[PDB]
Amino acid sequence: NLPEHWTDMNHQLFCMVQLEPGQSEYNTIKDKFTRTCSSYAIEKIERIQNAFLWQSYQVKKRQMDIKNDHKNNERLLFHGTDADSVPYVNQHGFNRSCAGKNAVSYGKGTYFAVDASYSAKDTYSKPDSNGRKHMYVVRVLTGVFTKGRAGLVTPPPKNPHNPTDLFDSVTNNTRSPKLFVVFFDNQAYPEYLITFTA
Amino acid sequence: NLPEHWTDMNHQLFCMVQLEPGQSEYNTIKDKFTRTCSSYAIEKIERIQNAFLWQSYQVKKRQMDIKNDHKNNERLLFHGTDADSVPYVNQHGFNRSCANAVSYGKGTYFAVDASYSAKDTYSKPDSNGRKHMYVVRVLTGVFTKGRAGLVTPPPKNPHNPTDLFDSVTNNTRSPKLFVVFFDNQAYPEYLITFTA
Ligand SMILES: NC(=O)c1ccc(Oc2ccc3c(=O)[nH][nH]c(=O)c3c2)cc1
Ligand SMILES: NC(=O)c1ccc(Oc2ccc3c(=O)[nH][nH]c(=O)c3c2)cc1
């Protein structure tokens, strides 16, 4: 069940693994980040190994891959948060019940950015007492999506005469998506934590 | 993976199966209800066969059995709701974001006694007087007393804030309700359609 690239946790359920600059795994994340935030500098990048979050996520992915039958359900997105949130996200993932109101709300859920530049804003990745900012890189089950609306507590139906058959997520703009909102637990796996500074 | 007492679904992932009155399964579920609701009239009982909800719930059960190092994590509880919520729950289960009082926290509420779920405030009568109550497998695990404004259960010791209780209750020594704060901690197993 657990990915073969992960470090041996030997009977442990959770581990943060520090990556090494020069490895393809560190460099692909650093490049995805610097593509839009070349003003900030990366302190470190940690791989999140959370067995339970991974299992529940992989079950949801397989279900959405079966339901949508077209396999393009997963995007790699960013999520800036405050230091006080990091230990909870590392252990328990993204909880919509803890989510702030977004300055442009497309629903009451957890928000993920396409561009690191938006997650790098102090309003999301709030600098801690030492000036460290925190951003997750996140596997998100975006699935089939539509433009959201501020009132949503779940994704809207695809068809108003079948109210229980839902979009998987919502976005700000279906043509040029810049954010995604997810409304269910285990729809997002926090894969890497980037610690960065001015 | 799919329980042996489920009936064939012709390669479908979702089915509501009406139970045969007077057989073992129906009698077991009826007696759980009539223990405290002997004055109500059962119109029908349906087995909820939702493969995806079941899979997600069984994963959380296996996770809680490991974390707690024992298999006493699951209880059978009741949840009354309005008819307009029934299709959603059948398909998607219980959702804290849908949300009656939330005195013990902002989660989904389950009753120990069917009589509490049978009150009209929960199992709201429809046009024709039909009321709806789910029988629910709930991962109550290790629980504590709730309070207003909880968004997750409390920590089992604030020296490790991320190691949480599984659920909260009104009274730890004699509970009558349980609150859970995560998707897939509750499987809706049977839908009882009844009248006063
Ligand atoms: N929690 C977060 O980190 C976060 C941050 C930003 C965010 O909304 C965005 C709003 C607008 C834009 C945009 O106009 N262009 N590109 C973007 O990526 C973007 C994201 C959602 C979530
Ligand atoms: N949506 C629901 O069905 C629902 C209904 C009621 C409910 O709280 C209860 C409150 C008090 C009591 C009690 O004093 N004795 N026995 C009970 O079972 C009980 C349950 C939770 C959930």
Curated annotation (Swiss-Prot), chain A:
Effect of Y124C: Reduces catalytic activity 20-fold. Abolishes activity
Residue ranges occupied by any PARP catalytic domain in the UniProt entry: 2-198
Subcellular location: Nucleus
Purpose: Mono-ADP-ribosyltransferase that mediates mono-ADP-ribosylation of target proteins. Acts as a negative regulator of transcription.
Family: Belongs to the ARTD/PARP family.
Protein name per UniProt: Protein mono-ADP-ribosyltransferase PARP15
Source taxonomy: Eukaryota, Metazoa, Chordata, Craniata, Vertebrata
Gene coding for it: PARP15
Shown chain mapped onto the complete sequence: 481 to 678 of 678
Curated annotation (Swiss-Prot), chain B:
Species: Homo sapiens (Human)
Domain PARP catalytic per the UniProt entry, residue ranges: 2-196
Outcome of substituting G80A: Slightly reduces catalytic activity. Abolishes activity
Cellular compartments annotated: Nucleus
General function of this protein: Mono-ADP-ribosyltransferase that mediates mono-ADP-ribosylation of target proteins. Acts as a negative regulator of transcription.
Signal peptide: none
Family statement drawn from the similarity comment of this UniProt entry: Belongs to the ARTD/PARP family.
The name this protein goes by in its record: Protein mono-ADP-ribosyltransferase PARP15
